[PDB]
UniProtKB/Swiss-Prot annotation, chain B:
The keyword Hydrolase applies. There is a cross-link at residues 347, 349, 372 (Glycyl lysine isopeptide (Lys-Gly) (interchain with G-Cter in SUMO2)). The chain holds residues 114 to 582 of 626 of the full protein. DCTP 1 binds at residues 36, 51, 97, 102, 192, 195, 199, 246, 255. It comes from Homo sapiens (Human). This is Deoxynucleoside triphosphate triphosphohydrolase SAMHD1. Allosterically activated and regulated via the combined actions of GTP and dNTPs (dATP, dGTP, dTTP and dCTP): Allosteric site 1 binds GTP, while allosteric site 2 binds dNTP. Allosteric activation promotes the formation of highly active homotetramers.
Length: 445, 443
C-alpha cells in the first residue's frame, strides 16, 4: 500500500508498510505531544512542531540516502533489508525524548536525579524495545525480509552507538564492509547526519529563519569512498559551498533560537515547576506502579504517557500540593519571568557536568561579594543554566575527486534570578561576578 | 514601548503594549493548546499549528490593512484608536474556539446539547469579556486612547456581528472598518489571508495570493452608497489565485475524508466522557466538557489537553472513551460508507444531527441483508460550508480611484463495524436513507 504523507519540507513521503506498523503505535505516536524546540514556542509562535513530524522526516531522508548510495555503487551490497533497517532507525532516533525535548534530558533529570545517567538516546532504544515487544513488530519484520535479532541490533546501534562498548570493529548489527551505514542517522564525527538535515530544514521553516543548504543536492552527489582505509560517506568536492551554507544555517539556528535568552529562561522556569511538582504528579506504569515525572524513565510503560501534557496537567490542577509549581506556569503566561543576571564561560576545556548541576546555584549563593550587599539571596532564588553547543568546519568532512570517485582528496553559563526587586537583582549580579571569579570563569560583561 | 515577534508567515510583527497585555493572559494563552486544523494533524504531519499564532497573524494583518487604508485616504479619517480596536478584534477573533477547533462547535456541542445554540464567535465575545475583566485591561485601554464602552462594543460587533445602520460601536461613515476582520459578503477578510497562508505553510500546499499586494493596491470606494473596501483592477489576477487557494485547502485539507472521520472519532470519545470529565469553574462549580461553554472560568481550561486526559486516564468509567482514542493511535478508524447532498431539499440542522444515525439504521434496504446494523454503528457527518466570487468583489481603476467598476451541504456516512459484510450492509442502509430522504444518489 505504500502510504503517502504530505510533509511541508519533503513533500510527498512514501512509507513502507513496516514503517507504518511501527508509526501507528502508542509508543510512537507519543512524539505528537512533545514539542521539538520545547520552550522555544513561547518565543517563536511558529515553533508549534513536534517530534513526530521530525522522526518521519528523518526516516524519509535516511532512506533517500541509503537508496541513492546503493543505486550509484552496486558494489557496496546495500540491500533493501539495509534500506528498511536504516529507515526504522532514523524513524526512532527521538523515540526516547521526554517532555519539551532537551529540557528533559539536559536540565530536568540532572536536577531531579543527579546520580542517574539518562539520555534521550538510551530512552530511544528502550522505547524501541517496548514498541516492538508491545505491538508484535518482530513477526512483521520477518515478513518484510528483516532478520529480527541482527536487525534490531543494527537499528539500536544506529541510534545509541556500540551497545557492548586501537582495537577492531565494535558494532555487531552489520559487518565492517557496511560501516558507512552507521553514519547516516547519527554521526557527530563529521557532524553531518540526516537527522540534522531534517531538523535544520524544519526548525528553519517553522521558526522563520532562512535555510541556505539543499539536502537534495548532497544526496545526489554523495558517494561512499575510502578514507584512512575505511568506507565513509563522502561527497563531491563541489558541494563544499553547500556544506559551508549548511554550517551557516546551523550557526544561525543556534544563535537566534536554541540559545535564546528568553526561550532558555522559560525552559528553566518550566523545569522549576516540574521539580516542584515531582513529588505529587503520578504517572501510572506497569502493574499500576505509580512512577513520577523524574522516575517514569524507569518504566517505559509510563514514559509512554509522559509528554508535554504534564505542563497543562500542572496548570489546570486543583491539588493544593501543586500550587507552588502551578504558579510558576501562571508566571510564564502573565510574562513575569525570571530576570537575566549574567553570562560567563568555563576556563580552558573545563565543562560543567550534569551530575553537578544542582550544586551550581548553591555555590552562587555561598559566594562572598566583596562589597557587602543589603539583601542576601539564597540558592532557591538562583537559577544556573548550562548551555552546550557542539573545530574548523569543512576540514573534517570528506570529499572525493570526480575523476576518481572511489578515493578521497563550548559551554555558556547563564545565571537568572527568581526575585525581581531592583535590589535583589543588584545582589544577584554581585554574587554572580564573584562566583565567576572564585571559580575562575570569564569576567561577566 | 513595542514588542517585536517573529512569525514564519508575516515576518516581524510589531505589537502595541495594549495588545501585549491582552496576549499575556491565561485566556489568550489558552489558544496555544487548540490545534487549528484539529483532526487534520493526524493526516497532515505538519499541521501542528494552534490558534495562538493564527490570532497574532490576524491581529497583524488587520493593523496593516487599516493603517495603510488611512495613509492613502486621510479623508476616511482613521485614528490610532480605530487601528487599536481593529487590531484587538483581529487578535481576539478566535478566543472562543474549543478543543480541536471547528469540531467543538460544529459537531460536539450540537450532538451533546441539541437544544443549545453555541457558536465559537459568541464564545469569543464571552472570553474577550472575561479577559478584559479578569486582567484589568479597561484602564489600560483608557491609557492608550480607547473609550472602553464604545470601543469594546466596536470590537465585539467586529467579531459576532450586529446586535438602518445596525452597529452601535462605530458610525456608518466608518463601515469599511467592519469588513477587515470578517467580511461575510466578499469572503475577503484578514482572518482568511492569514489562515490560508499559515495553513498552506504547514500542510505542504502552495498559496499564490500576495496579501501584501492587496493591502497595497487596496482602497475604500463607494458601492450602492455604502463605503466598502475594493481592490485595483490589476489585482484580479491575484484574487483569482486566492479563490483557487481556498478551494484547494477545502478540497484537500478541510474536507479530507480521513481527517473528517478522525474528527468524528474524537467527538465520539468526548461524548463518551462528558458525563465523567470535571472542569472546575467559577466558585468550584464542576462543569463537564459540554457545559464549560457556559462558564468561561472553566472554558479557559478546556483545550485539546482533554484528548490526552482521556488517553492517559485510568478511571474505568472512561475506558470506553479511551478505547476510541486508542483506535486513532492504532489507526483502526471508522470506515467511509458514502456521501450525499440535500439538493432541492431542506438543509440538515444541528438540532437534528443526533437523530440522524438512527434514521440511517431505520432504513429498510430493499434487498434484505444478513447483517443488521444499529444506530450506534453509523456516524453521520454534516459538512456545511459558506458562485463566481470575483464578481461579488468590488473593483476600482487608478484613473478615477473614488469610483467603482461550491456545494452548501455535504452529508457523509461512516460505519464503525469494519468487516466486509458490515460495510456492505452500511452502504445499503445509507443508499436507502438517501432515497427516502430525496438526497442525491450516493455515487
Ligand atoms: Fe532528531
Ligand atoms: Fe481565524
Amino acid at each position: 500500500t505504500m502510504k503517502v504523507i504530505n510533509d511541508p519540507i519533503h513533500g510527498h513521503i512514501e512509507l513502507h508498510p513496516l514503517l507504518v506498523r511501527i508509526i501507528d503505535t502508542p509508543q510512537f505516536q507519543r512524539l505528537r505531544y512533545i514539542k521539538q524546540l520545547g520552550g522555544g514556542y513561547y518565543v517563536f509562535p511558529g515553533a508549534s512542531h513536534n517530534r513526530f513530524e521530525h522522526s518521519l522526516g528523518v526516516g524519509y531522508l535516511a532512506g533517500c540516502l541509503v537508496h541513492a548510495l546503493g543505486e550509484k555503487q552496486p558494489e557496496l551490497q546495500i540491500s533493501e533489508r539495509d534500506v528498511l533497517c536504516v529507515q526504522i532507525a532514523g524513524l526512532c532516533h527521538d523515540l526516547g525524548h521526554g517532555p519539551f525535548s532537551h529540557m528533559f534530558d539536559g536540565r530536568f533529570i540532572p536536577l531531579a536525579r543527579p546520580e542517574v545517567k539518562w539520555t534521550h538516546e538510551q530512552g530511544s532504544v528502550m522505547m524501541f524495545e517496548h514498541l516492538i515487544n508491545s505491538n508484535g513488530i518482530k513477526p512483521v519484520m520477518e515478513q518484510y525480509g528483516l532478520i529480527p535479532e541482527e536487525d534490531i541490533c543494527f537499528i539500536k546501534e544506529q541510534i545509541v552507538g556500540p551497545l557492548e562498548s586501537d582495537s577492531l570493529w565494535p558494532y555487531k548489527g552489520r559487518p565492517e564492509n557496511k560501516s558507512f551505514l552507521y553514519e547516516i542517522v547519527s554521526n557527530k564525527r563529521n557532524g553531518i547526519d540526516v537527522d540534522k538535515w531534517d531538523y535544520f530544514a524544519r526548525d528553519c521553516h517553522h521558526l522563520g529563519i532562512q535555510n541556505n543548504f539543499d539536502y537534495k543536492r548532497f544526496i545526489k552527489f554523495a558517494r561512499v569512498c575510502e578514507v584512512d582505509n575505511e568506507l565513509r560517506i563522502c561527497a563531491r568536492d563541489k558541494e563544499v559551498g553547500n556544506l559551508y551554507d549548511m554550517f551557516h544555517t546551523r550557526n544561525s539556528l543556534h544563535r537566534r533560537a536554541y540559545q535564546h535568552k528568553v526561550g532558555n529562561i522559560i525552559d528553566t522556569m518550566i523545569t522549576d515547576a516540574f521539580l516542584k511538582a515531582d513529588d505529587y504528579i503520578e504517572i501510572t506504569g506497569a502493574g499500576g506502579k505509580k512512577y513520577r515525572i523524574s522516575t517514569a524513565i524507569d518504566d517505559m510503560e509510563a514514559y509512554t504517557k509522559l509528554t508535554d501534557n504534564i505542563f497543562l496537567e500542572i496548570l489546570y490542577s486543583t491539588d493544593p500540593k501543586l500550587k507552588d509549581a502551578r504558579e510558576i506556569l501562571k508566571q510564564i503566561e502573565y510574562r513575569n519571568l525570571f530576570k537575566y543576571v549574567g553570562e560567563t564561560q568555563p576556563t580552558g576545556q573545563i565543562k560543567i557536568k550534569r551530575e553537578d548541576y544542582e550544586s551550581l546555584p548553591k555555590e552562587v549563593a555561598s559566594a562572598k561579594p566583596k562589597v557587602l550587599l543589603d539583601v542576601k539571596l539564597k540558592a532557591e532564588d538562583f537559577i544556573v543554566d548550562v548551555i552546550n553547543m557542539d573545530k574548523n568546519p569543512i576540514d573534517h568532512v570528506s570529499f572525493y575527486c570526480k575523476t576518481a570517485p572511489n578515493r578521497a582528496i563550548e559551554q555558556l553559563i547563564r545565571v537568572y534570578c527568581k526575585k525581581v526587586d531592583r535590589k535583589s537583582l543588584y545582589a544577584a549580579r554581585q554574587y554572580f561576578v564573584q562566583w565567576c571569579a572564585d571559580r575562575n570563569f570569564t569576567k561577566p560583561q
